Design a protein around this ligand. Sequence first.
Ligand SMILES: Clc1ccc(Nc2ccncc2)cc1Cl
Ligand code: NI
Length: 315
Amino acid sequence: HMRHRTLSSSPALWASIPCPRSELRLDLVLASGQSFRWKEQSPAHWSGVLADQVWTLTQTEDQLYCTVYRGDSQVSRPTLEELETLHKYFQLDVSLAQLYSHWASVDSHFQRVAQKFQGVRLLRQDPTECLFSFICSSNNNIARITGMVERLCQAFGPRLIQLDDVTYHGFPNLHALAGPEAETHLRKLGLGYRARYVRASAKAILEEQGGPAWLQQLRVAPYEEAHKALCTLPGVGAKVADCICLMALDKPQAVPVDVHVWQIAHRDYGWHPKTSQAKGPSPLANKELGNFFRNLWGPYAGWAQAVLFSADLRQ
Ligand SMILES: Clc1ccc(Nc2ccncc2)cc1Cl
Ligand code: NI
């Protein structure tokens, strides 16, 4: 039936937001493992869902070209409010050129690495989508998580539209994931142990915290409160909590610490746990390392990390 648009195919329906490739590189941000809902359907054309709507995105050296598919009606070009949404998603208020410059000034390693990887910024994700996406992320790779999240949305989330062979679903609400046959069905979809944590966390957020409004509270709450709050949930530890804080709760200073960042810290910064003596990853050593990077980079430490992370997936 209807198909995925290119910029050439249907130039009428595309709109644009003025955005240099130095401020945002789609190819580095949408497959960076922040969101797992974007695919490059046709070369340099990124399609994925936002809320209850599909988008396809592509860019030039100075422009971010984008179009919407409402799903239900007259196919038209992105409205103003629809583009405000997109602007916010990419947190484009924030100057990346300034942040790169600031980091480079205090970190000679960053200076050498950031050159080849410009336009790495953080998305502002829906808390719910982010939470459950990052529960599926423990002991896993981007490819597998992408899969799990797609199957999860297909099975539990509302159908929106079909383009080509791909049927786009919205992200499920908590109630949908909280039900009795939720784990069983999720286990069928190959999440394994993670199925328990999904259901449990959905059931928890409803009953223990009073629904999705809780997550919005954490967005306005201070970092430290939000992190402690998140860590109460089944399947959510310091790492996942920091991912969510950073990517969906507007805490730029949150620095998710796993064994991979340990490696980079030790190899590239010569870091060892100083207050600690135990020589390997630990609750306290990880937090120590988080504080280390905040001290060095400042209150957008998580964003700086995102640059290094994106420079590591490319060899
Ligand atoms: Cl800054 C950042 C961005 C994206 C991710 N995504 C992940 C990719 C693979 N396994 C776990 C998480 C993680 C960080 Cl720490
Ligand atoms: Ni050493």
